[PDB]
């Protein structure tokens, strides 16, 4: 049943949702048959340090988002959902299962979990099929909350499990986005650091290959606008990607064969 | 009478229709005289594998759609109907018989069945009269649901039986479109594969003549925008085409005499 | 009184009218004094061959329409009336007698009967006064229904008899238009065939002089847009034309003296 | 009192007025004091030939209208009034006396009678003061109905008896306009014949000086658009013209001194 | 109290006011304190010849209006007030005293009386302060009605008596404007005659210096559009002019020192 | 309490306010705490000579207004307030204290008193801080009414006393503006006289340095449009200026140090 | 509980808020849980001198605001909030905690306190992360009121104490902005003085490095428009900056390492 607090939606870009936690949980829960979610939605845990009141920043809570939009947009605005207007009706806006299964416009923003091997080394995450084409960004996020999709649905009622998603009703504000990799043709050409990330003391922990241009972003950065040529979530819809392999993410590529 | 589940409209592009299955079935059924449809609408069966929950991909369920719109549009948006707004009134939007007989704007999107001879080899499908003119695409679809038109009406009240149509209220999402043939003057010049097709392990089963350019699509593909110079369904209206012959579809042409 | 079925309006371009047959018949009938139409409106008989359930295609049901609009418009859209919006009020939209007498905008599309001599050979039809000027088209139609004007009103209360009109409330869809003659200065320069005509097996029966360019139309045909330089019905209003003579229509002209 | 039939408004361009004859007559009659029109409005008589039911075409019913608009406008649209919208209120739209006295916008269109001497030869009609300036047209009309102004009002209650006006509530359709003289600087330069005039057998009766260009009009005629450089009735308002003399109209001028 | 007939507003350009005489008189009268107008508004007398019904054309009834707008505007449209819409509310539209005192927008149009010496010779009228600057017109009017301002108010409640104003609720139609003097830099350069003036037999009585270009106007006259480079009444507001002297108006100037 | 007559608002540009004197006084008075205005608003006295009814024109009643708008605007339109629409609500429009303290948009127009020494010679008035920059005008006004701000408020409730402001609800009409000094960089370059000033016999009393261009204004005067490059009251808000000194205003400057 | 007077919002740019003090305080207070603000909002004290009623101008009350907008905007308009329309609903407009935590649009304007060491010498204030990039302004403010954020919330319920914010509901008018430093690449290039600052006698107290261009502003100053290339509060959101160090602010830089 209902969440005790609004932690699950604390990263929200649509800030007005944050004070309507219970109402939102009901609105979403009622379009989910008990057989699909026997125990109800499962919110991620320990997204916040109990000792600090601060975002938990560890491999286990490290989220990723593939997006064609550049840092001058994302580091300024965060991830705003496709639907931004208030509508307390059972319309498609809050229809979670339809959103995941069909990618219909909604108030939800997806992310996928960073993947590690047993030695705790990073391996290929769920990657979009079009990742090797043109310019794409892989944003690194540490945010409070999110719905743990795979833990919320019975295997046979969970539309696409392979994507290992953590969904954010209302989106994610920019202060929860630590960095991003800028890829051109599947190759890393730059690493962007968001100086306004909620925990600036961890900025030096941002990893990447050696000798790759690393830039500290600021509004209207001269090189922060690269983009192709619209559905901002096309590259985050389950059937539009997959986990290509379990190779170590220790090269200059995104580990997808050309 | 009424369908047990919403399988018939599960491919829907107008996703809001999927949760209003019974209401939609009533809305459509009431403008159909009992003498036209003695037993009611007949929904296609076995469109989904009961053992996997997955789309049934076999010759028997292989659908085709002739369209002048290119892959950069279709593989991105799917087949969205001419009418996209909600209207629970008995207007023409849901008037199935008028749509079939006159091609009036509606929420329906049509497909025609792939045709095979007794040896299970492909033969000429229902083809538009204008197929040999300019640029046209023949999309290959495997989707859940659809209304089996020929099985839903007495032949005496079925506007156009030859087309053997399977109609999709709400359209078809792009993940159900596996590939497309690009024809220029009735000749195949390229075969496009949709990497995001719901069952990617079958992509290698896509057939075509030998040595024809085969391309894996991605958004804004450089050659994915070819189009002539609007009624997107003009080339799918029954009187606007026919089954030209039963010849084997084993050449570079669409089997229509120049 | 009332028609048994909606055959009279089955060719309708304004398809929403087809399901409101009785209401439409009342709407029209009430603005017609009993002395003008003692026996009520007389619908054309045998427009559909009951043995085939399809359009009757014979000289006796062959209709013509003079229009300045070219095939790229007409073969695509059919004949849509000057008034296209729904209005169940006794406004001028449905005022049949006013439309005939004055040519006021309405939901009616006019046609005139093809004319034959006693040997069954074609003779000059009712022709517009401006027919020898510039570019004009003479469309050939075989459609279900239509109101037989001369049989609906008494001789002495029938505004203009010479025209032998067949009026179509809601217009005529393109599949009922078999061909058209393109005239330039009163001379035939091309014969256009509509491949999507409802009975394609009769396309070879389309007549015309010998050695005249004969073209099978398709959307946006390169030569299908010729037009002068608007009232689309100007050339179909009774006082705007006449039957010039009873000569055989066996030459390259429209039988009007230059 | 009330007219027996709607003959008085049968020439109407605003066709919707034709079925509201009695209501219109009341609407107009109530703003006319009994002392101004002791016997009520007097409608012209014999505007229709009682042996044929067609418009009476004789000198006695020959009407004229001075207008700056050319044949490409007038022969296509007729004379449409300055006010064209429906308004069953006692507004100025139907205020006949104000219209005649002030030329305020209304649903009325004025014409003036052709003038003849006792030998039945044509003499100078009421002519606009600006007639010798630039380009002006004198249209010839034979229409059913019209209000006989001079016979409708007591001499001292008739604003401008001199114009011998016949007013048409709702205007005059083009089929009632037989021809027009095109004047440039008060000189006839062309005679236009309307081939669509309601009685085409009388077209040869159109008179004019000898050896003047005579043209049979058609839509968009190349020379049918001459016009100066708006109140379309400026040149038909009583104080804006007069009967200049009673000379024979047998020259190339409009009989007004330069 | 109330006027017996509507003579006072018979010159009205806003013709709809003419039938609401009593209502208008009340509307205006109620915003006028009894001490300002002890005897009520005084309408000009003998503006209309009781014997002909014709406009009285004599020095005593000769009115003038200074205006920057040229004959192509004024002789075509007359003097239309700054406020032209119907409003039966006690708004400023009909507020006579505010209009005279402040020049606020209203339905009124001002004129000033022509001035004569004891020998009946014309002397300088009330003239605008800006009269010697650029292009200005002095229109000559003979109209029925008008409110005699100086006779309507008690001297100490009459804002500006020196102007000798005759005010026209609803304005003045062009047929009441006989002529105009066109001044450039305070010098007469042309005399315009309105051929459509209500009494054309008096046109030859129009006076002016000798050998000054005299033109008979017609719509769009080539020289009838001269104007500077908006408040059309700026030059008719009392504080904006004065009676400069009592000199004879027998020269080429407007009798104002340069 | 309430003013006996509307003298206080007689200069009004928003003329509709003049007849709603008592209502306006209430509307303004109710948002003024009794401790701020113990005795209520104090209206200026002797603004109108009781003997003549005329505007009192003496040093004592001489008002000034600093404005960036030129004579072609001001001498034509007067000083119209920032808010011009009717609103009988306690909105900010009539909020006198907030207007004085914050300069929020309202129906009020400020002026400041001309300043004199004990010999009755003019000394520096309250001057805007930006007066020495670019082009600014100092208008001279003699108007009826106005609220005497310093006499209306208890010193510790009066926002800014130093300005010796005279506020005009509804603004000031142009006939109350006698002249203006045009300054460029704090230097007088021209003196403009308004010939339409309510008392033209005093025009020669307009003072200024010797040998400075003196111009009599008229609409669209060629040099009457000089302006910089909007809040028209920026230079009349108390904190935006001050009384710089008490020096004699007998030079070509505005007595502010460069 | 409630504030005794409206001092807290007296600097308001949205002046209509000033008269709705209690209502505003309730509106804001009700969305603040008692555990977050045990004692309610704490308004700054001694922002106004008790003896004179004038603004308290001392180090203690010296506020700063980092803004990308230049003096031609700010010194003219002040700091107007992102939300400017009236809305007495519990919408996000007045949601103080959401504002502070997320930077959502609201009626609030942030400022940060000037920082001093023990000797009372200025040290580095909270500075935006992007301060060394391009052009940024640091405005100096002395205003009445403001909410003392750090004193209003219990440590663990104060989103971002590090900013040491004083928040102004309704913004700050320009007369409370004394000066601004213009930085280019983190270096001071000009010091702007607002001559209209509420206490002009303190203008000489404005400090800065020696020999830096010092300019007295006026509307449209030629160099007062420098700006980069929009969220006007981006550089005032807590996570978007920090207190870089406690070094003396006695150099030309903003004390942030390049």
UniProtKB/TrEMBL annotation, chains A, B, C, D, E, F, G:
Origin superkingdom: Bacteria
Gene: mtx1
Name the record gives this protein: Mosquitocidal toxin
Lineage, uppermost ranks: Bacteria, Bacillati, Bacillota, Bacilli, Bacillales
Residues of the full protein shown: 33 to 298 of 870
């Amino acid at each position: 049943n209902s969440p005790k607090d609004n932690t699950w939606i604390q990263a929200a870009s649509l800030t007005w949702l944050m004070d309507m936690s219970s109402l939102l949980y009901q609105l979403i829960s009622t379009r989910i048959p008990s057989f699909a979610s026997p125990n109800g939605l499962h919110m991620r845990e320990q997204t916040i340090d109990s000792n600090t009141g601060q975002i938990q920043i560890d491999n286990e809570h490290r989220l990723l988002r593939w997006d064609r939009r550049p840092p001058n947009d994302i580091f300024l605005n965060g991830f705003i959902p496709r639907v931004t207007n208030q509508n307390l009706s059972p319309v498609e806006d809050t229809h979670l299962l339809n959103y995941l299964r069909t990618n219909s416009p909604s108030i939800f923003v997806s992310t996928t979990r960073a993947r590690y091997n047993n030695l705790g080394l990073e391996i290929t995450p769920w990657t979009p099929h079009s990742a090797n084409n043109n310019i794409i960004y892989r944003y690194e996020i540490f945010a409070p909350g999110g719905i743990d999709i795979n833990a919320s649905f019975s295997r046979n009622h969970n539309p696409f499990p392979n994507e290992d998603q953590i969904t954010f009703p209302g989106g994610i504000r920019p202060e929860f986005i630590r960095s991003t990799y800028e890829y051109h043709n599947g190759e890393i050409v730059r690493i962007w650091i968001n100086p306004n990330f909620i925990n600036p003391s961890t900025l030096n922990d941002v990893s990447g290959p050696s000798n790759i241009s690393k830039v500290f972003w600021h509004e209207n950065h001269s090189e922060g606008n690269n983009m192709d040529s619209y559905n901002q979530d096309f590259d985050m819809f389950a059937p539009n990607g997959e986990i290509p392999n379990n190779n170590l993410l220790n090269n200059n590529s995104l580990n997808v064969i050309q």
